[PDB]
Design a protein around this nucleic acid. Structure first.
Lengths: 102, 144, 116
RNA sequence: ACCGAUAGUGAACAGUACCGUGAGGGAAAGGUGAAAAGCACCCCGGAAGGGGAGUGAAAUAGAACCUGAAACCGUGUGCUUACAAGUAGUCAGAGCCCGUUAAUGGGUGAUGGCGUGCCUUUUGUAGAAUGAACCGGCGAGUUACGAUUUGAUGCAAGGUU
RNA sequence: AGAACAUGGGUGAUAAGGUCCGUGUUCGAAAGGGAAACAGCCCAGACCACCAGCUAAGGUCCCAAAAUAUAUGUUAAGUGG
RNA sequence: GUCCUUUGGACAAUGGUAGGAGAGCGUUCUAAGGGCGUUGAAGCAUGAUCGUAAGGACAUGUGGAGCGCUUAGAAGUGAG
């Protein structure tokens, strides 16, 4: 019913049919991405992957490759005439789950 | 990813009974402070009040160790010049021991407005008798 | 030729005054005090983006420790047992499962426990 | 490849108002509309002022008349506030009210964490060391002629007036 | 115009958060964690994002994260003779 | 930066006051080329937009005659 996948440098709890936001993947819009590294399967029968579950794939369809909300990074030092200002937007990929395998 | 339970809002608080007979003041105090704080719930958030009610009833069989009774003076000032007052631990336990226990619970809680509220979930009684039977209170045993 | 110090000064000052919106009293209306508060808050945000990570890790650890004492075990001993079992699940993941499915968390506790 | 009303003459309307016994010093102050067609008449009012009506492309263009920022002063309203200790923000986060350059949307915010303004001068300043009531305008490495050293370009035993 | 610290010395009184040299470190010009708070002490050098993980110095009863952990000993004093 | 140089796979690097070096953003004016404007220019006000920064757009309301862009040039060229 729920699965744990390790993608990007992070771990995410997922369920059949929900939307997730991860660090950028090399994929185009429309395509189907499949995740390998599955760590936990929370179904009727529970599978624990201490390393991996050995099988255990999660399927998803890519939609909306995108770049995130912008943040201004600002720092200064008091009686010293130094300050720095710069902008950052972080990329992401948006996915919807369809399959949890085991 | 933000997959993270925080919204404790709509929690369920329960009611507990601990008895003071033959315990140490500080050790009972710290465990009770933890329960009032809510540190024992898998659902715990510091910005909303989880945690639940604790009833202490014997508050007269409190036990000190060493010479705490004659030492351990308590102090207070009235903001009036030379207005420092005092009382020693043993005679505070002998007259108004409920104050003795609840003071040392409340000194172990945060001093925010949420913390001073969490200290209001505490009821102390000298002697083994209390009025709170409609709340259906459960016995809790000090799991040291 | 002569330039006037014209419309550029207001535009630059008006950005800061808009960016100070919602502040208290003079803080959201006067340029010199608004500029100071808007540079002070930018230095707060850097520090606090670093601090979020450690704040949520502290909360996850305390919720797992609460979940561990329910099954008569300590947080430190539990994480050691999971390391020896090899389990790669995460502090945040370990809290989210311990909150949603206690029965999945109990099997993890038993495997973490007989790994020792 | 000079200024456009704090500029350019002190002076776009003045060696005047004003100040000084005198020699003398010395300002602030441009803009209705294409055309006065510059609001007949009724209503309130002692009047001022206003409300209609009228003229006009347009009277929040009516003489305090082009546009009309900010400080500062008000009227109304969505959310919030009378057990609370503070450089007033930031990060988290319920509840209520909304609907945009529709997008990982906007307003407000019970409650939790962290957190002693800026500039100058100093070995060292939250400093009980200096300066600033607030807002607007103005306010500080320039030019001429020489010298040295880099870059560029033309010609070269020549190169240049 | 330098400053504290540890070590080598003069001066002073085997005084000074004193003063003068020498050998290092750090502040100056350095944010982050610890020492309650605390330029100069201990750990460590911030290009930007993340609600990922391992560690340093310091720590694990509550405030306030993590052992009311083990096994084995001292202490009864609470924080010139 | 580095260098195999597939300029990408890496080997990296990237706190900072006096101060040295590099690359840019805006303002006024001129030349040349192309534009816009009473079917509404500049200015002013609001917005939930874009750019690594200085900054640039677009929509709407107010305003009622002027003003951008591209390449080059010249300065009374930026205030807390």
């Amino acid at each position: 019913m729920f699965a744990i996948i390790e993608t990007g440098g992070k771990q995410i709890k997922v369920e059949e049919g929900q939307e997730i936001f991860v660090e950028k993947l090399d994929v185009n819009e429309g395509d189907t991405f499949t995740f390998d590294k599955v760590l936990f399967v929370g179904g009727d029968s529970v599978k624990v992957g201490a390393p991996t579950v050995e099988g255990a794939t999660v399927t998803a369809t890519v939609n909306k490759q995108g770049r995130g909300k912008k943040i201004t990074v600002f720092t200064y030092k008091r009686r010293k005439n130094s300050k720095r200002k710069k902008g950052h937007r972080q990329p992401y990929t948006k996915l919807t789950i369809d399959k949890i395998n085991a | 990813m933000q997959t993270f339970m925080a919204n404790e809002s709509n929690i369920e608080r329960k009611w507990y009974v601990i008895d003071a007979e033959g315990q140490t003041l500080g050790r009972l105090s710290s465990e009770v402070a933890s329960i009032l704080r809510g540190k024992n719930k898998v659902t715990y958030t510091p910005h909303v009040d989880t945690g639940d009610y604790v009833i202490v009833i014997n508050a007269s069989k409190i036990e000190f160790t060493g010479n705490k009774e004659t030492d351990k003076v308590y102090y207070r000032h009235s903001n009036h010049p030379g207005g420092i007052k005092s009382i020693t631990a043993g005679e505070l336990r002998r007259t108004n021991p409920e104050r003795l226990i609840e003071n040392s619970i409340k000194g172990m809680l945060p001093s925010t407005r949420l913390g001073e509220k969490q200290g209001k979930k505490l009821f102390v009684y000298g002697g083994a008798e209390h009025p709170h039977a409609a709340q259906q209170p459960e016995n809790y045993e000090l799991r040291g | 030729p002569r330039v006037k110090g014209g419309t550029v000064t207001r535009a630059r000052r008006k950005k800061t005054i808009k960016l100070a919106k919602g502040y208290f009293g003079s803080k959201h209306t006067l340029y010199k005090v608004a500029k100071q508060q808007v540079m002070k808050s930018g230095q707060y945000a850097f520090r606090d983006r670093r601090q979020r990570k450690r704040d949520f890790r502290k909360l996850w650890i305390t919720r797992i420790n609460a979940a561990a004492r329910q099954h008569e075990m300590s947080y430190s001993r539990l994480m050691n047992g999971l390391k020896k079992a090899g389990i790669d699940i995460n502090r945040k993941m370990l809290s989210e499962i311990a909150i949603s499915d206690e029965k999945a968390f109990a099997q993890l506790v038993t495997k973490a426990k007989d790994a020792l």
